Amino acid sequence: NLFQFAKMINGKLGAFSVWNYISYGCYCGWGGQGTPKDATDRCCFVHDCCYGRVRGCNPKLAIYYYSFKKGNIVCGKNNGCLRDICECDRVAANCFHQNKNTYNANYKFLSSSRCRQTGEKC
Amino acid sequence: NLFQFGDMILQKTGKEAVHSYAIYGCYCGWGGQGRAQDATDRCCFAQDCCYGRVNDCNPKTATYTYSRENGDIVCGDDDLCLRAVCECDRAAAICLGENVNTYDKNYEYYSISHCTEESEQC
């Protein structure tokens, strides 16, 4: 669920990190339309595509199991839709951490007028 | 999509969703577990369950057709996925506006250090 996604982000990037992903680019947290603005936004777009492939469970509400092992996110003990959801989150949190250097604070809190309809597909 | 849900929230509550409801309680913000803390949070839990019924529609990125005409929110799609996502958002924005007088800023950014009660069940 989102509670757990937030913990992955914070555990990977540092306390308060998750608040950076509430509304960023066209796809991080909020939004959901347009061409991803940069690599962090692309991580979020891929995460929505990942969530879009999940069937039978609700990605915001499903509680999976994960842990940190020597600072790395490890999904474990998950069956079916819980497995897939955890993996979506794990990969996205890792992708944010990989692309942290190019996070652009001017892409925070974009309005829909900055994210025009495009042909962006999963 | 979430940009469109933000517009409905603005129209019914006067708030900008990315700075308020997006980080509120256990169900409006990044939670998805625990108890809904108040009426606002319970609106969001009902929306989360609503999204859960139309998971395959990919509610985050589903750009639907809606209009505000005469102060009302009207969903215009014939396409059942788009229409249902729009009705989920419409109902949530109506509910949020009905409960704006109990909106409590103590629940902004609250999810990460609370929300561990037995969770609501859709």
φ, ψ for residue A3, nearest 5 deg:
-55, -45
* Elucidation method: X-ray
> Which residues in chain A touch residue B19, judged by CB atoms under 8 angstroms apart?
109
How many Å apart are CA A30 and CA A19, to the nearest integer?
12
The structure tokens listed for A39 are 């690599």
| Cβ within 8 Å of residue A82, ≥6 positions away | A57, A62, A63, A64, A65
DSSP-derived secondary structure for A61-122: T----EEEETTEEEE-S--HHHHHHHHHHHHHHHHHHHTGGG--GGGBT--GGGS-------
Instruction: Search chain A and give the residue with CA nearest B46.
Output: A61
Tell me how far apart the alpha carbons of residues B76 and B121 are, in angstroms, rounded to a whole number: 30
Quote the strand ranges of B32-121, DSSP E.
66-69, 72-75
Residues of A near B (Cβ–Cβ under 8 Å) read 1-3, 5-7, 10, 18-19, 22-23, 27, 29-33, 48, 51-52, 54-63, 109, 111-112, 115, 117
CB A89 within 8 A of CB A5: yes
* Contact check, Cβ <8 Å, A32/B60: yes
> What CATH code would you report for B1-122?
1.20.90.10
> Which positions in chain B touch A1 (Cβ < 8 Å)?
31-33
This PDB structure is determined at a resolution in Å of 2.0
Q: Which residues pair with A68 in a beta bridge?
A: A73
- Give the C-alpha separation, A60 to B51, whole Å: 9
Which tokens in the block code for residue B43? Answer: 């609106």
A31 is an annotated ligand-binding site residue: yes
Cα B74 to Cα B83: distance, rounded to the nearest angstrom = 10
All structural domains of chain A with their residue ranges:
1-122
Helix (H) or strand (E) holding B44: helix B39-53
Contacts 24+ apart (CB under 8 A), B14-21: B14/B100, B15/B100, B15/B103, B17/A30, B18/A22, B18/A23, B18/A29, B18/A30, B18/A109, B19/A109, B20/B103, B20/B108, B21/B96
Q: Which CATH architecture has domain A1-122?
A: Up-down Bundle (1.20)
Residue whose token pair is 């005409």: B69
The residues, ordered by sequence, that sit 6+ positions from A51 with a Cβ below 8 Å of its Cβ are A59, A85, A88, B58, B60
Question: B122: nearest CA in chain A?
Answer: A61
Assess contact for A11 and A73: CB atoms under 8 A. Answer: yes
Report yes or no: B55 at the A interface, CB cutoff 8 Å. yes
A21 Cβ contact list (under 8 Å, min separation 6): A9, A28, A29, A44, A96
* Residue A89 annotated in active site: yes
Q: Which residues of B9-26 are buried (b: 16+ CB within 10 A; e: fewer)?
A: beebbebebbebbbbbbb
CA pair distance A12, A14, nearest whole angstrom: 6
Half-sphere exposure of B111 (CA within 13 A, CB side): 32
Q: Which residues share a beta bridge with B10?
A: none
